Amino acid sequence: DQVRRFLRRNLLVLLTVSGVLAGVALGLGVRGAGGGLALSRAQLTYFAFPGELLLRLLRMIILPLVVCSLIGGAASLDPGALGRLGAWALLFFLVTTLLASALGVGLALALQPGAASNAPSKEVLDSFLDLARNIFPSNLVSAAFRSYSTTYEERTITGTRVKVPVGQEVEGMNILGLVVFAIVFGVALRKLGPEGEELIRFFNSFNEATMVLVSWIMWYAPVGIMFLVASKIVEMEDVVLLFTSLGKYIFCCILGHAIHGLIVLPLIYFAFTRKNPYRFLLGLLTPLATAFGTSSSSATLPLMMKCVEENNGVDKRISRFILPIGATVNMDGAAIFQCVAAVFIAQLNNVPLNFGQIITILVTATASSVGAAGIPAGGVLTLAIILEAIGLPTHDLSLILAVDWLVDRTTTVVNVEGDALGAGILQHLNDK
Amino acid sequence: DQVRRFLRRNLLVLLTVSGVLAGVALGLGVRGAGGGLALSRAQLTYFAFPGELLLRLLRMIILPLVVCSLIGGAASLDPGALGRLGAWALLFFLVTTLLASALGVGLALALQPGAASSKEVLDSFLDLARNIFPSNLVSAAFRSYSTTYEERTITGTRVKVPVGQEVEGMNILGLVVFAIVFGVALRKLGPEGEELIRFFNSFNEATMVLVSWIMWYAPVGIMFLVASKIVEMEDVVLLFTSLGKYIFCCILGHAIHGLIVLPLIYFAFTRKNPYRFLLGLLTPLATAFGTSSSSATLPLMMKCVEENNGVDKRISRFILPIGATVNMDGAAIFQCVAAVFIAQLNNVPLNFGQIITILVTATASSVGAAGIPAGGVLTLAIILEAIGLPTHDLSLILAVDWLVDRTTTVVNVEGDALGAGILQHLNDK
Amino acid sequence: DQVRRFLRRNLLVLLTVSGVLAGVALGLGVRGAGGGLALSRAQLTYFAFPGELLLRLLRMIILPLVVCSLIGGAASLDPGALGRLGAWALLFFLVTTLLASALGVGLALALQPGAASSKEVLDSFLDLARNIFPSNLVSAAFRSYSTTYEEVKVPVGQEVEGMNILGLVVFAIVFGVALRKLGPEGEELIRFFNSFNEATMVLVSWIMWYAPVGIMFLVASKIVEMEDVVLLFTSLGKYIFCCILGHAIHGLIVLPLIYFAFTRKNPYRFLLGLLTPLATAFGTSSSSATLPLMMKCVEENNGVDKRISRFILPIGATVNMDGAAIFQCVAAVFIAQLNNVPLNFGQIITILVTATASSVGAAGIPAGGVLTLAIILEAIGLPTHDLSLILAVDWLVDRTTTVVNVEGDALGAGILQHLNDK
Amino acid sequence: APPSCRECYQSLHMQQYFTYHTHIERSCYGNLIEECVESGKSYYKVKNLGVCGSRNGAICPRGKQWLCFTKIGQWGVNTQVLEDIKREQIIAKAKAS
């Protein structure tokens, strides 16, 4: 009878895998019907309708999550603001997240997971200006559904081409401005007195309610995932190309994880408090295996911290302060996954990306970490944040969730490794 | 002095009736003279300007009231003190509202009061479904999804492509469903959820106070609206007959619903004598016909239903606020038949798709209304704006309120009573 | 060193003055032998970009500030403490603000600052009255009603872009009064709005710390864009003279005139009993910073009494800024005259009413007039390019308008006290 | 042979020169879309419904009577409108034959 009880206790995973497999089977079958696809684009829309409903629900939830969780995380920054070691920890986490995300986007651009197959474009400096203008939105309410973009206008003065910008308010929600406003508002509330605690209690309750909505939406998800996969299979010809692109994206993400966690972090260890990091790596061989197997960052925290304390040596107080607060903040592997996934989605639709969009990707991937205390970072939710920030279709989110089961383990192991290395280097710095 | 108590008891109603009568008199007088020179659209807008101000006040007070009343309710009404039978009560309320709205559609189509002698169906269904789950909450406060077809030219033959421009409006479906789901989440959350409940409830009381203030200014706006719409029409006799047909259709629908639907809901459950069970209670129906508030009659309703016939305190306390705040079926059929009347008088096309969309929006937009007497015209205006219909006869359908609104609140009280009786007869089993 | 302590005490003022001076110097140096006006529009935009960032930051923060400050102020107000006198005070504040704004517009039209050598009036009045009551609060945060012609030209509304400050201010006042009338159940909402307003205030303080570099870049870009700097400098001088004459003759005539008409108790003696709060308001432009010292001076120098003073001064220091209305009116009319657009009676009435309402909705910020000026400039429809001139010389007019506001509320307190004397 | 769109022209103070935008919001124009060619380059011309300045919450060019698009918009943070244009162009090209 325990077989039935196991299914009841793990209904979400079974339903999700059943939905993915049913979507693949349905797409293959309807592609095999007749000589080829002949249904009209109206029927394509009718077939992809449940996926559209799912994506609308996700965006509707993206807005309150961004406006609330960032405020809460910024206002709850006092454990690291009460000491110099906390400031060093926060700075190290931020710098490591930026460098990891840059490495991920660079490796994804270089390896080209997609592709394998005139409209004008913006300018690099004008894209930078658009990026900087979107940092501070002109209006708070108008930023909930509209963004800024430099639309270009062309004049033909008796044969002389003239190319002039306009810079109107292009429709489409900008999250980067909302993130910046939320962060600065959270800092302002932290600098405020006792009434700040009441306001942030308000915001935390709102964020928790929105999280409950996230849970219900993820409960609804499998049918929408099925229909999204089916519609993608129908619309995208050469399904073998799609499968091999998914495989190349998986290999790209694993390679990014490996290069980060085996070169960049040991380089940081060798730089700060110069000594060999391989010793600490061999010491902590246990917790990395537990993190790779269980694929849970919070569950491996006590065993990993006790193993760090027993093996080699640690002040224990520095570790006892860093590890609980660094486990759900660092998110190195989350940054790698989010950057590589955003690049892969942008390349699967043959959508070129400029410098402004890349810097936006890096900044939002970093800024989701400070709000990760209230949102489930490392999943497809932060990827949806990034996709809405840079303005790409999100019909490939289901396809990426189809491989999330197999590229999440290395994410957790590299996050645990990064936290451990940071704790070690800060302990050695504090020892002096 | 002796009549001062009567003047104080119904001063707002008397003032509204006097305003409507004075507006009719002003319209007849201004059309009596050479009104052809004053028939210009600029002068008509000049007359209708205060009515436009009143309608703008109602439109701006829509969203606070609806969203926060629904949030507070859904985060407070759901717990109650019962179990699975509460789901039975909610399902009965939903099916009763749907059936009443469908009856309103049927009678509006059959009678055709609007006598004065488009989009595909599947696309309409898809636009209704997308409006239920809004893409952006802030964007949903002032616009709604809508699909339209294009005719882009490529050196020859004609094509036809939908784009979904998301025209300006207000999607009550998305706001209502988001408020309901947020209230359920806040229920399931815990104590800081209760703090949010107190926040939203206080905001809702502030909105109620502001609405009560606005309904004091309402009579002068409605009287200018009556005068402007009377002078606008070519003949005053060609509009009164349409208004008579409309009020007859509304009253007939209300009477048919309240008198043959709920006894048919009992059907074979006649262990509680349906006409005798209803005749057990008359004081609340008389009170709700005198005044016009479902909330103001709630304590007398509760005490009468508790001490007159067989019912439990714990189930009446749980069910009666639902009827007084969520179960305005009468307002639903009122706004539905009024919207169909507006559509048919304006010579717009009618088909299955937009009529099922208006059915869904009427049956899911009445739950956002409150117990304020003149609380149906606000939801009605938002529905007619959202269904892609012009605001033309809103003035006269606001003018005819003093009896239809009383009938709506009477049938709402009756529906709540029948639901409570059904739950009582189900619990004892 | 004592000079170090002095510059630490007031660093923002020195920093912004040095920023304006550096912007003028850099702009003249660039326009001299650094390519001149040969820079294109795109390069001028790139040069002015930090100022664009400052302007966008200023426009971002005005909406939460007004919507929550007004709600908190109206909810905390208790007109029932003194019956049949709060109405007199509100009427007095309204009429003095309207008279100040009319004075500001009339002198702006007469003196013609920056004057180098279309909707009907009924439609404008109708649109102004219609914009007071919005149709959707969320839509009113970024869109305002306006009438266009298309067909005898029948008018049709369109709800063009632009923040609607009339409807927001009116709704905030009504909501605050409703919250007060609610009773003990609405205490939380009031505390929440006050906390949000305080957070917005500290955000404002950070933004005004950032301001001097933006002012420098704005003034540099504007002085290098124009090819005739003499005209721009003379226009700025005409603007300063016009505004100073406006809200100096206002404070030295209109308020003493009404005081002498009402109670004839030598208003100049009342002012000359009130020296040091005026100097404090002329030193720092924060109206809220001068509230307690001016309380002490008015209590120890006049028999205004304490009940009356704490009934009227906290309200009169936030919703009674007549000088701010004068500055906004003069600045907007000067901007309109710089673009050589004709002015009709309808939009003069509209700009007067919206400037008065937005002055009611402004705050006691050290520089609170620039945000309101930008909003009202966008409201009626005017190009936003001359704000650099007003922002560059905002300091002198800003201290003078703070002096005007504090003397206006002091006169209001005195007149209410003498009415209470009966 | 598409018509030569003269209405796309703009007058500058006397000289008339052809001008055309790159990205214009969907809410700014209605349903009648015509294809015009200027010196061998195909563009889309339409009446402008955003004379006042905005429509349906979307900003539109001010003081222009006839808008004049390019066939495919720009990739500069154009959100999804560009993808929708891509689908409409591919289906129009498919239906042309």
Q: What is the 3-state secondary structure (H, E, C) of chain C?
A: CHHHHHHHHCHHHHHHHHHHHHHHHHHHHHHHHCCHHHCCHHHHHHHHHHHHHHHHHHHHHHHHHHHHHHHHHHHHCCHHHCCCCHHHHHHHHHHHHHHHHHHHHHHHHHHCCCCCCCCCHHHHHHHHHHHHCCCCHHHHCCEECCEEECCCCCEEECCEECCCHHHHHHHHHHHHHHHHHHCHHHHHHHHHHHHHHHHHHHHHHHHHHHHHHHHHHHHHHHHHHCCCHHHHHHHHHHHHHHHHHHHHHHHHHHHHHHHHHHCCCCHHHHHHCCHHHHHHHHHCCCCHHHHHHHHHHHHHHCCCCHHHHHHHHHHHCCCCCHHHHHHHHHHHHHHHHHCCCCCCHHHHHHHHHHHHHHHHCCCCCCCCHHHHHHHHHHHHCCCCCCHHHHHHCHHHHHHHHHHHHHHHHHHHHHHHHHHHHC
Cα distance between residue A237 and residue A117, in whole Å? 11
Which of A234, A175, A83 lies closest to A368 in space, CA to CA?
A: A175
Q: Which structure tokens are listed for C317?
A: 């220091």
Pairing of strands D54-55, D58-59: antiparallel
Q: Can you tell me the distance from the alpha carbon of A360 to that of A132, in angstroms, rounded to the nearest whole number?
A: 10
Q: Which two tokens stand for residue B342?
A: 């507006």
B326, B77 in Cβ contact below 8 A?
Answer: yes
Q: Is B384 exposed, middle or buried (0-12, 13-18, 19+ CB in 10 A)?
A: buried
A122 touches chain D (CB under 8 A): yes
Give the span between the Cα atoms of B383 and B342, in whole angstroms: 11
- Tokens encoding A364: 């939002």
Distances (CA, A) of A63 to A54, A329, B196, B225, B273: 15, 21, 19, 41, 53
Max CA-CA distance within chain D? 45
Residue where the block lists tokens 């197997």: A293
Q: How far is CA C216 from the centre of its chain?
A: 22
Q: HSE-up of A271 (CA within 13 Å, CB side)? A: 8
Alpha carbons B381 and B55: distance in angstroms, whole number: 8
The residue in chain D having the minimum alpha-carbon distance to the alpha carbon of residue B170 is D56
Tokens 């919005």 — which residue? C134
Do residues C203 and C68 lie in contact, with contact meaning Cβ atoms separated by under 8 Å?
A: no
Q: Determine the Cα–Cα distance for residues D30 and D16; give it in Å rounded to an integer.
A: 26
Pull the structure tokens for residue B218.
């309402």
Q: Is B218 exposed, middle or buried, given 0-12, 13-18 or 19+ CB atoms closer than 10 A? A: buried
Q: What sign for the dihedral angle of Cα B396, B400, B401, B407?
A: negative
- Distance, in Å, from the CA atom of B45 to the CA atom of B17, rounded to the nearest integer, reads 24
A169 close to D59: Cβ distance less than 8 angstroms: yes
The DSSP output letter for A146 is: B
Task: Report the candidate in B290, B307, B220, B314 with the shortest Cα–Cα distance to residue B19.
Answer: B220
| Residues in chain A closer than 8 A to B138 (CB atoms) | 63, 141, 144-145
Per-residue tokens: A229:
């996969």
Residue A165 exposure: Cα atoms within 13 Å on the Cβ side: 22
Q: How far is C145 from chain D, CA to nearest CA, in Å?
A: 11
DSSP D35-88: EEEETTEEEEEEE-S-SSSEETTEE--SS-SEEEEESS---SS-TTHHHHHHHH
Report DSSP state, residue B80.
S
Q: What would the two tokens of residue B104 be?
A: 């309103």
Sign of the CA dihedral running B117, B119, B122, B127? negative
Q: Using CA atoms, how far apart are residues C376 and C358, in angstroms rounded to an integer?
A: 8
What is the pairing mode between strands B149-152 and D32-38?
A: parallel
Q: To the nearest whole angstrom, how far is the Cα of C188 from the nearest Cα of chain A? A: 10
Which architecture characterizes domain A2-117+119-431 according to CATH? Orthogonal Bundle (1.10)
Region of B161 please: left (phi>0), alpha (psi -120 to 50) or beta: beta
* Separation of alpha carbons C351 and C329, rounded Å: 7
Please tell me whether residue B392 adopts helix, strand or coil conformation: coil
Q: Please tell me what DSSP assigns to residue D10.
A: E
Q: How far apart are CA B200 and CA B179, in angstroms?
A: 11
Q: Which residue has the tokens 């302002």?
A: A188
Nearest CA in chain A to B193: A205
Q: How many residues are given for chain A?
A: 432
**Domain segments of chain C: what residues?**
11-421
Instruction: Answer whether A172 sits within 8 Å of D17, measured CB to CB.
Output: no
Handedness of CA A70, A71, A72, A76 (dihedral sign): positive
Distance CA C380, CA A116 (A): 54
Distance (Å, rounded) from C-alpha C42 to C-alpha D74?
Answer: 19
Tell me the three-class secondary structure of A298-362, residue by residue: CCCHHHHHHHHHHCCCCCCHHHHHHHHHHCCCCCHHHHHHHHHHHHHHHHHCCCCCCHHHHHHHH
Q: Which residues of A touch C143 (CB under 8 A)?
A: none
Q: In 10 A of CB C151, how many CB atoms?
A: 8
At A161, is the secondary structure helix, strand, or coil?
Answer: strand
Pairwise CA distance, residues C130 & C121, whole Å:
14
- Rounded to a whole number of angstroms, the distance between the first and last alpha carbons of chain C is 56
Q: Which residues, 6+ apart, have CB-to-CB distance to B78 below 8 Å?
A: B183, B184, B187
Closest to C353 (Cα-Cα) out of C329, C373, C374, C383: C329
Distance of alpha carbon A388 from the chain centroid? 11
Long-range contacts of C142-147 (CB under 8 A, 24+ apart): C142/A139, C142/A141, C142/A142, C143/D54, C143/D57, C144/C379, C146/C381, C146/D52, C147/C119, C147/C123
Q: Check if the beta carbon of residue A176 is closer than 8 Å to that of residue C176.
A: no
Neighbouring CB atoms inside 10 A of A7's CB total 12
Closest to C148 (Cβ–Cβ): which among D52, D57, D59?
Answer: D52
Angle, CA C376 vertex, CA C370 and CA C381 arms, to 5°: 125
Question: What are B152's strand-pairing partners?
Answer: D33
- Tell me the H-state helices in B271-393: 274-279, 283-290, 298-308, 313-325, 329-345, 352-365, 377-386
Query: Is the Cβ–Cβ distance between C337 and C112 less than 8 Å?
Result: yes
- Residue A357 and residue A361: Cα distance in Å, rounded? 6
Angle at CA of residue B56, ends B356 and B343, nearest 5°:
30
Cβ atoms B163, B150 nearer than 8 A: yes
The tally of CA atoms less than 13 A away on the side-chain side of residue D70 is 20
Q: How many residues does chain D have?
A: 97
- List the resolution, Å: 3.4
Using the beta-carbon criterion (under 8 Å), do B148 and D88 form an inter-chain contact? no
B398, HSE (Cβ side, Cα atoms, 13 Å): 32
**How close A390 comes to chain B (CA, Å)?**
17
Spell out a b/e string for B280-312, using b for 16 or more CB atoms within 10 Å of the CB, else e.
bbeebbebbeebbbbebbbebbbebbbeebebb
- CATH fold of B4-428: Proton glutamate symport protein (1.10.3860)
Candidates A130, A162, A115; CA nearest to A354 is A130
Rounded CA separation A187/A179 (Å)? 12
Find chains touching chain C: ≥3 CB pairs under 8 Å. Answer: A, B, D
| Contacting subunits of A (3+ beta carbon pairs below 8 A) | B, C, D
Four-CA torsion A310, A316, A318, A319, nearest 10 degrees: 40
Q: Which helix (H) or strand (E) holds D16?
A: strand D15-21
Judged by DSSP in three states, B45 sits in: helix
Instruction: Return d(Cα B186, Cα B200) in angstroms, integer.
Output: 11
Q: Which CATH architecture has domain C11-421?
A: Orthogonal Bundle (1.10)
* CB contact set of B425 (below 8 Å; sequence gap of 6+): B269, B271, B272
Experimental method: cryo-EM
Option in A42, A141, A205 nearest B192 (CB): A205
Those residues with Cβ within 8 angstroms of residue B79's Cβ, 6 or more apart along the chain or in another chain = B187
Q: What is the spatial distance between Cα C204 and Cα C58, in angstroms, rounded to a whole number?
A: 8
Cβ–Cβ of A144/B136 closer than 8 Å?
yes
Helix, strand, or coil (residue D19): strand
Establish if C119 touches chain D: CB-CB under 8 angstroms: no
Query: SS3 for D12?
Result: strand
Helix, strand, or coil (residue B17): helix
Could you tell me whether strands D15-21 and A152-157 are parallel, antiparallel, or unpaired per DSSP bridges?
antiparallel
Are the beta carbons of A171 and D57 closer than 8 angstroms?
A: yes
Q: What are phi and psi of B349, to 5 degrees?
A: -70, 155
Contact A280, A416 (CB under 8 A): no
Give, rounded to a whole angstrom, the gap between the first and last alpha carbons of chain A.
Answer: 59
Residue A91, token pair as written in the block: 């700075």
| D47 and A194 Cβ atoms separated by less than 8 Å | no
**Is the distance from CB of C319 to CB of C308 less than 8 angstroms?**
no
Length of chain C (residues) = 422
Chain B residues touching C129 at Cβ < 8 A? 49, 53
Which residues of chain B from 134 to 193 reach within 8 Å of chain D, CB to CB?
Answer: 139, 142-143, 148-156, 159, 161, 163, 165-168
| CB contact set of A61 (below 8 Å; sequence gap of 6+) | A210, A213, A214, A217
Within 8 A by CB and 6+ apart from C314, the residues are C291
The 3-state DSSP class for residue D11 equals: strand
C413 vs C313: CA distance, rounded Å: 7
Task: Find chain B residues with C-beta within 8 A of C188's C-beta.
Answer: 198-199, 202
For B185-237, the DSSP string reads HHHHH-HHHHHHHHHHHHHHHHHHHHHHHHHHHHHHHHHHHHHHHHHHSS-SH
B311 Cβ contact partners less than 8 Å away, ≥ 6 residues apart: B305, B420, B421, B424
HSE, CB side, 13 Å, CA atoms: give it for residue C187: 3
C165 CB-contact burial (10 Å; exposed 0-12 / middle 13-18 / buried 19+): buried
The shortest CB-CB distance from A136 to any of C60, C161, C163 is to C60
- Give the Cβ contact number of residue B404 at 10 Å: 20
Token reading at C84: 């049949």
Report the Cα C199 to chain-centroid distance in Å. 21
Q: What distance in Å separates the CA atoms of residue B264 and residue B330, rounded to the nearest whole number?
A: 17
How far is it, in rounded angstroms, from Cα C130 to Cα C146? Answer: 9
Cross-chain Cβ contact B185/A59 below 8 Å: no
Q: Give the phi and the psi of residue A162 in degrees, each rounded to 5.
A: -120, 135
Separation between Cα atoms, residue B164 and residue B179, nearest integer Å: 25
* CB neighbour list of residue A362: distance below 8 Å, 6 or more residues apart: A98, A101, A102, A105, A339
**How many other CB atoms are found less than 10 A from the CB of residue C134?**
26
Q: Which residues contact C300 (CB under 8 A, 6 or more apart)?
A: none
Pairing of strands D15-21, D9-12: antiparallel
- Rounded to whole angstroms, how far apart are CA atoms B272 and A22? 51
Distance CA C391, CA C216 (A): 10
